[PDB]
Amino acid sequence: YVGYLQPRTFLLKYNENGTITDAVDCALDPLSETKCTLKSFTVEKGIYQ
Amino acid sequence: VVLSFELLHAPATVCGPKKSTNLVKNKCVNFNFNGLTGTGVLTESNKKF
Numbered sequence: 001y002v003g004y005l006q007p008r009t010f011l012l013k014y015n016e017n018g019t020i021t022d023a024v025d026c027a028l029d030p031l032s033e034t035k036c037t038l039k040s041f042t043v044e045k046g047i048y049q
Numbered sequence: 050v051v052l053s054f055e056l057l058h059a060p061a062t063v064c065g066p067k068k069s070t071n072l073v074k075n076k077c078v079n080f081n082f083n084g085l086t087g088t089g090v091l092t093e094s095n096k097k098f
């Protein structure tokens with residue numbers, strides 16, 4: 001498999017071990033943009049600019 | 050001769066002459082770890098690098 005890298009901004013989650021467990025790609029979809037804005041992988045109910 | 054000093058977050062490995070001093074614990078002692086300078090107490094760290 002071959003893929004190509006692009007300049008993007010990511011939100012990476014480091015656990016207590018120190019390993020990157022999860023990641024969010026901000027520009028993928030509006031939910032990911034909301035997550036990157038709020039700096040949390042869980043977004044509560046509401047409207048977010 | 051133009052000596053360009055490119056510095057960034059990496060092992061420098063270009064460290065002009067300086068001696069080493071025995072490590073101390075549980076005492077506020079100035080530290081210079083491979084160019085990272087500061088003050089504080091040094092303790093054995095349980096985190097897994």
Ligand SMILES: *[C@@H]1O[C@H](CO)[C@@H](O)[C@H](O)[C@H]1NC(C)=O
Nearest residue numbers: 015016017018019095096097
């Ligand atoms: C993460 O740290 C915990 C602490 O006890 C340990 O049990 C666990 O094995 C560690 N995870 C890995 C992948 O080593």
